[PDB]
Amino acid sequence: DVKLVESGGGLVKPGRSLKLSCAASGFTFSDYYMFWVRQTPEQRLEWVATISDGGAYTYYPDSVKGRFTISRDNAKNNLYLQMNSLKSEDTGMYYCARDPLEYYGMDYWGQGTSVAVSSAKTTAPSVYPLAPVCGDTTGSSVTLGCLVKGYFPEPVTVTWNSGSLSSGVHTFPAVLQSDLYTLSSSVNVTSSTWPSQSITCNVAHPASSTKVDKKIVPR
Amino acid sequence: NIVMTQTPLSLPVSLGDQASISCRSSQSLVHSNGNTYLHWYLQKPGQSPKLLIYTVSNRFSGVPDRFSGSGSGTDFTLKISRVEAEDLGVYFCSQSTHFPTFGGGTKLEIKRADAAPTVSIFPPSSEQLTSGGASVVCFLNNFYPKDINVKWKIDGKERQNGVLNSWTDQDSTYSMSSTLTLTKDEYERHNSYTCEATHKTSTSPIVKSFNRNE
Amino acid sequence: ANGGASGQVK
Amino acid sequence: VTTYKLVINGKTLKGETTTKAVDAATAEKVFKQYANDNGVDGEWTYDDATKTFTVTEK
């Protein structure tokens, strides 16, 4: 069956360039028009390039015209995308896809390759405790958290009490904040549980080799 | 430049339910050759889009006959006669009559009973303030449906500037964090901080506050 | 036109 | 550049982090910014053999 495998994505500084490849198998590659389609972090799909079956004709939207070049090697069953003068808005998952023979469309897509364009340097996160506002004598359940701010690149990993505190935890997806990443996690426990028992967020940022624990104390 | 718009944004369903999603194009999708190149795709998390319906109503290879498409000109709909768990994900329409463009996607998700959020507000930590920064955080946990409106109010005035929100994926409930990031100096400009949530479950907002000087 | 930005109809 | 390490022995923050720097002094500035960003306030020591700095709070 038809298979497409994209590769090559990585981090590149703004103004820089990168080449993506897309290996095709299970069909006569040379008979089909091929595309590159990307999906942004907010999950919108955007067509970025088209190439005719034989390779002579290439098409691009205005957002990419003059910076991207789609190409293909029909002997090796490879589709390519050279990206020049990269901008932060080019950050996204890149897919190659095939044009069916009897209608204009996209029948098969690959699993994708991620591209990130940023001028940030590797930075370990700051880990701040989110303890409840002081003075709560209700005896109701308490919600605690950890704020993991200013790291790059992704990702980070977060556990509570080395993973033994797994229920009632919400770890939110990272957001780009000051050209760096930020995430948070919350954990909810009965009031007889904390602060009598310690609660600690365990944070890891592989890229900076950071491994830190932050015990959450009351205000 | 043909704009593709999907309705609804999200469509919660129970297993076994019928499902309908619409896709509106800014201009006719009829090609000069008479055909309408309007397609539907399903994308599951971590996977690429897969073709479901091509050229308005043609089922792609392997697609069950539970899926059907129709519509004409500029208004099209994808139907699921009976929803199964494997159907859940985001459905996208696209058009290939002009240079390819895609709708924003309709997420098909599992219906749950309505649930109000549990709201908790957190002042900046001592640690961050020592550092010169001030993040105020609010968690809005375990609610349903997903639509929720959150407002930061400082001495009664709304603040949108510096607010970033992050939503957890679908228990079947949703959760969300809102973080207002200020400098220490800005944070010290005001004393009353409130995180206010408006959700379908109630006519009244859920308000959680603290005072910088307490 | 046949072949173009959105593919072809062979 | 070479790799330098930091051992943080704080009252509530404990663990490790690293940085790539031209020399130890250059690494110490990155690490003091990092500790300051995490609210740490402690005594700095350095182990030459393992190119590891330690910041310990009372």
Q: What is the CB neighbour count within 10 angstroms for residue B63?
A: 17
B139 with B205, same domain: the answer is yes
Give the gyration radius of chain C's Cα atoms: 5
Do B107 and B126 belong to one domain?
A: no
- For residues B106 and B22, what is the distance between their CA atoms, to the nearest angstrom? 9
Query: Chain A 76-135, CB below 8 Å of chain B: which residues?
Result: 95, 100, 103-112, 126, 128-135
Tell me which CATH homologous superfamily contains domain A1-119. Answer: Immunoglobulins (2.60.40.10)
- Taking contacts as CB-CB distances below 8 angstroms, the residues of chain D near A128 are 38-39
Whether C2 contacts chain A with CB within 8 A: no
**Same structural domain for residues B187 and B161?**
yes
Which residues in chain D are closer than 8 Å to B126, comparing Cβ atoms?
Answer: 39
Of B79, B112, B145, the position where a domain reaches its end is B112
Inspect the interface and report whether the beta carbons of D38 and B125 lie closer than 8 Å.
no
C-alpha separations of D22 from A51, B92, D18 in Å: 47, 50, 13
Resolution limit in angstroms?
2.0
Q: What is the DSSP string of B114-126?
A: -BPPEEEEEPPPH
D38 and A213: CB-CB below 8 Å?
no
- Say yes or no: B138 and B103 in one domain: no
Per the structure, how many domains does chain B have?
A: 2
C8·A101 Cβ contact <8 A: yes
Selection from D8, D40, B190, B186 nearest residue A128 by Cα: D40
Place of tokens 């005001």: B190
Query: What are the sequence ranges of the domains in chain A?
Result: 1-119, 120-218
Pairing state between β D2-9 and D52-56: parallel
Q: Is the peptide bond before B123 cis (omega within 30 degrees of 0)?
A: no
With contacts defined as CB-CB under 8 Å, which chain D residues touch B127?
A: 13, 38-40
**Residue at which a domain ends, from B61, B82, B112:** B112
Query: Do A1-119 and A120-218 agree at the fold level?
Result: yes
Q: CA-CA distance, B53 to B49, in Å (whole number)?
A: 12
Question: Which residues of chain A are within 8 Å of residue D37 when distances are taken between CB atoms?
Answer: 126, 150
Query: What's the CA angle centered on A208, arms A203 and A213, to 5 degrees?
Result: 20
Mark whether B65 and B168 lie in a shared domain.
Answer: no
Which is nearest to D21 in space by CA: D35, D31, D7, D8?
Answer: D31
- Domains (ranges, CATH) in chain D? 1-58 (3.10.20.10)
- Shortest distance between the Cα of C3 and any Cα of chain A, in A, equals 7
Q: Can you list the positions of beta strands (E) in chain A?
A: 3-7, 11-12, 18-25, 34-39, 45-51, 58-59, 68-73, 78-83, 92-98, 113-117, 126-130, 142-151, 157-160, 169-171, 175-176, 181-189, 200-205, 210-215
Copy the structure tokens of residue A128. 């701040």
Task: Count contacts between A and D (CB, < 8 Å).
Answer: 41
The coordinates were experimentally obtained by X-ray
| Token output for A25 | 């198998």
- Going by C-alpha positions, the residue among B132, B127, D6, B196 that lies closest to residue A146 is B127
Residue D42 Cα, gap to closest chain B Cα (Å): 13
Residue B18 and residue B118 in one domain: no
Chain B residue with Cα closest to C7: B96
Please give the residue range of the domain that contains residue B179. Answer: 113-212
Are B27 and B132 members of one domain? no
B104 vs B23: CA distance, rounded Å: 10
* Chain A residue numbers touching D39 (CB-CB < 8 A): 128
Pick the CATH number of A120-218 from 2.102.10.10, 2.60.40.10, 3.40.630.10, 3.40.50.1970: 2.60.40.10
C-alpha to C-alpha distance for B101 and B38, rounded to whole angstroms: 10
* Phi-psi category of residue B155: left, alpha or beta, with phi > 0 → left and psi -120 to 50 → alpha: left
Which amino acid is located at B36 in the chain? T
Instruction: Please indicate, yes or no, whether residues B137 and B108 belong to a single structural domain of this protein.
Output: no
- Nearest CB to A105: which of B54, B101, B124? B54
Distance from CA of B128 to the nearest CA of D (A): 6
- As to burial, measured by CB atoms within 10 angstroms (0-12 exposed, 13-18 middle, 19+ buried), residue A84 is middle
